[PDB]
Amino acid sequence: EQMRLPSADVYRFAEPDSEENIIFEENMQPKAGIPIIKAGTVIKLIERLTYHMYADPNFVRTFLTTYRSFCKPQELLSLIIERFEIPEPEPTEASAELKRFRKEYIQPVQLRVLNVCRHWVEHHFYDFERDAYLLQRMEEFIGTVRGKAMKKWVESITKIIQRKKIAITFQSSPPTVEWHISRPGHIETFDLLTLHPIEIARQLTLLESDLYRAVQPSELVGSVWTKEDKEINSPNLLKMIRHTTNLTLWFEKCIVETENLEERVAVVSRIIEILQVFQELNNFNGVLEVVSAMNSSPVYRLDHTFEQIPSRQKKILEEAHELSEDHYKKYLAKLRSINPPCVPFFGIYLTNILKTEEGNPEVLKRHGKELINFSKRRKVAEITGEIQQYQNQPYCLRVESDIKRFFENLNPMGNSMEKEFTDYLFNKSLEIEPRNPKPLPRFPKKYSYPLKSPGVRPSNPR
Amino acid sequence: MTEYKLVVVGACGVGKSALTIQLIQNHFVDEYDPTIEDSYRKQVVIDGETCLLDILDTAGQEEYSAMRDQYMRTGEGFLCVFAINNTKSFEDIHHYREQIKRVKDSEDVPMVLVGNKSDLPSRTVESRQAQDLARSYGIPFIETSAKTRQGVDDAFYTLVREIRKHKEK
Numbered sequence: 236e237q238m239r240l241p242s243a244d245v246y247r248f249a250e251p252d253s254e255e256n257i258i259f260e261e262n263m264q265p266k267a268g269i270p271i272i273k274a275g276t277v278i279k280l281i282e283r284l285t286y287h288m289y290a291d292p293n294f295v296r297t298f299l300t301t302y303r304s305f306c307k308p309q310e311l312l313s314l315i316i317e318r319f320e321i322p323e324p325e326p327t328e329a330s331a332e333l334k335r336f337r338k339e340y341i342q343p344v345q346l347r348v349l350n351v352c353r354h355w356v357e358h359h360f361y362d363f364e365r366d367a368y369l370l371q372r373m374e375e376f377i378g379t380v381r382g383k384a385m386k387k388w389v390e391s392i393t394k395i396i397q398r399k400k401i402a403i404t405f406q407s408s409p410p411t412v413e414w415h416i417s418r419p420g421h422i423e424t425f426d427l428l429t430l431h432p433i434e435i436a437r438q439l440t441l442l443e444s445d446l447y448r449a450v451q452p453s454e455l456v457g458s459v460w461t462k463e464d465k466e467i468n469s470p471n472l473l474k475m476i477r478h479t480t481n482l483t484l485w486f487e488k489c490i491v492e493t494e495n496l497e498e499r500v501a502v503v504s505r506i507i508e509i510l511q512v513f514q515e516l517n518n519f520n521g522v523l524e525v526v527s528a529m530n531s532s533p534v535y536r537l538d539h540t541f542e543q544i545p546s547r548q549k550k551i552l553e554e555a556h557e558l559s560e561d562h563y564k565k566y567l568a569k570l571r572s573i574n575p576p577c578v579p580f581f582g583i584y585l586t587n588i589l590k591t592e593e594g595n596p597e598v599l600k601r602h603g604k605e606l607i608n609f610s611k612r613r614k615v616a617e618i619t620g621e622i623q624q625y626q627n628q629p630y631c632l633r634v635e636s637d638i639k640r641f642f643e644n645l646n647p648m649g650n651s652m653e654k655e656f657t658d659y660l661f662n663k664s665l666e667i668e669p670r671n672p673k674p675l676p677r678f679p680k681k682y683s684y685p686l687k688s689p690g691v692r693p694s695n696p697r
Numbered sequence: 698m699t700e701y702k703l704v705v706v707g708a709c710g711v712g713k714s715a716l717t718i719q720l721i722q723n724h725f726v727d728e729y730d731p732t733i734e735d736s737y738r739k740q741v742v743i744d745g746e747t748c749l750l751d752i753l754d755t756a757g758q759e760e761y762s763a764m765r766d767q768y769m770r771t772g773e774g775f776l777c778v779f780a781i782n783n784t785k786s787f788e789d790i791h792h793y794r795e796q797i798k799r800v801k802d803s804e805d806v807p808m809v810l811v812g813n814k815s816d817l818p819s820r821t822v823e824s825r826q827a828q829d830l831a832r833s834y835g836i837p838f839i840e841t842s843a844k845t846r847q848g849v850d851d852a853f854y855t856l857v858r859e860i861r862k863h864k865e866k
């Protein structure tokens with residue numbers, strides 16, 4: 236026997252599946268045996284989001300992350316309420332069909348709708364923060380819900396809603412903070428060469444880790460960081476990128492403003508040491524901010540400086556540069572192979588989300604009917620999911636609040652605009668190592684402290 | 698088989714993506730996964746010479762402004778793309794060209810100007826303005842429509858031609 240739901244004229248989610256309203260990919264959902272939805276009408280997507288035969292957490296997460304391109308939040312809420320409010324089938328002059336229908340259609344579907352509400356309110360509360368009437372409707376819907384089967388879920392949702400309306404310590408000992416020439420508390424002395432290179436890399440890894448972790452899927456889905464409201468919609472991604480840009484520029488600046496050749500060799504050498512430690516910490520954002528600086532046009536051309544760089548550090552830099560080659564082939568493989576904690580380079584994720592959204596249609600047409608292309612969204616949710624997997628695990632390192640401050644308040648550009656500043660860096664590069672055939676000038680030393688590095692190995696045991 | 702490393706550059710909100718996506722993807726499939734190697738590599742015959750295009754499009758990474766040199770340094774030829782409905786993207790072209798010349802350390806880098814039409818708003822950059830700019834740089838200008846695929850092959854094949862005319866010299 237089948238089941239006998241009401242007519243589509245009374246309840247729109249009764250309509251049978253056809254090629255005109257829902258289509259599937261030829262393969263089956265990993266771990267779980269569920270079919271993979273390729274496309275469907277919004278009604279069918281909502282039917283399957285709250286399906287009676289089984290639960291589908293994968294579809295729920297993916298849907299709630301990506302739905303806003305095809306369905307407004309208010310529309311989603313209206314649809315899941317409509318889904319919830321299931322009437323009974325009509326004549327049977329009187330209960331064989333009904334007790335079954337209540338227990339195997341109504342009760343499961345209603346539980347699935349509550350589960351959707353719960354995940355929505357827990358993981359995507361921003362829809363509600365941004366539209367208070369959406370929260371009003373959700374609260375009066377949840378207050379409407381009646382059954383004893385439902386009570387425990389309704390209570391739980393109401394608890395999450397209250398928690399959401401409201402305004403680190405380690406596994407075991409982190410390593411000892413490292414000091415070189417600048418002593419603790421003497422922030423006025425802090426610079427590239429005066430701080431310990433290990434601690435530079437560690438404290439930058441902490442900043443960049445927190446920056447990486449604050450970025451939410453709401454800043455990425457719909458490619459919103461590239462649109463006119465990017466500062467409104469992607470503030471954390473933007474702070475993260477700006478920090479990375481700042482440090483690349485700071486490295487360039489430290490290099491080309493060190494006019495004395497010997498001193499400049501020590502500066503470049505020290506930056507490569509910092510790269511070495513980034514690499515040990517799996518801070519790939521850090522790695523790439525160094526590689527970008529070395530590849531910058533003001534730095535890359537300084538052949539007299541790189542000539543004096545010891546071969547060991549030449550090789551470290553080369554290996555790091557090769558991560559970026561061939562569309563990040565080696566970066567991609569290295570990232571896959573390492574274990575958290577890490578700090579990914581975000582730029583790849585950005586490009587892939589954009590291209591995914593741009594290179595696939597919003598809808599597919601079958602027999603003249605428009606179906607939402609869900610597989611497109613799945614692809615985007617895979618990428619946002621990969622980003623989140625590297626956000627869970629923090630670093631086991633002690634913050635030093637003064638060094639943290641110094642790198643947070645770093646401003647190599649000053650009051651200058653980009654063009655003005657990068658032309659200045661390049662003219663500086665030309666001054667300190669002119670083009671052939673012009674001979675190399677000499678320049679006086681600027682650093683009154685010793686240039687020798689303490690190296691990149693910890694000073695004390697455990 | 699000769700391989701040409703091409704680099705696409707331009708402002709955000711512009712259709713750079715669409716340009717490269719439309720080149721790579723089959724003429725009649727609207728499917729694209731940018732993670733795999735076939736996403737950005739394509740074999741083509743241009744003037745009866747089979748060759749392999751490797752296209753770098755970092756669309757989405759425009760805020761990483763200090764990485765432009767890194768990315769540009771990888772290329773032999775460049776598509777400098779602007780959108781015909783965004784005057785600012787057109788005005789930024791001179792900066793991109795200048796930065797490419799600086800990175801490649803050459804006054805004569807293989808380069809094409811590409812003006813892309815997608816969807817509304819309407820045109821703010823007449824083709825004549827772009828023909829004039831292209832002429833002042835001594836480079837070709839190609840206008841494309843992402844959605845209809847008009848101009849896409851021509852843009853890329855013209856850049857490859859520019860690279861060949863640069864290398865025979």
Ligand SMILES: O=C(CO)N1CCc2ccccc2C1
Binds near residue numbers: 535
């Ligand atoms: O040796 C030199 C300059 O002659 N360099 C220039 C900077 C750079 C960037 C990436 C990889 C390697 C190198 C080494």
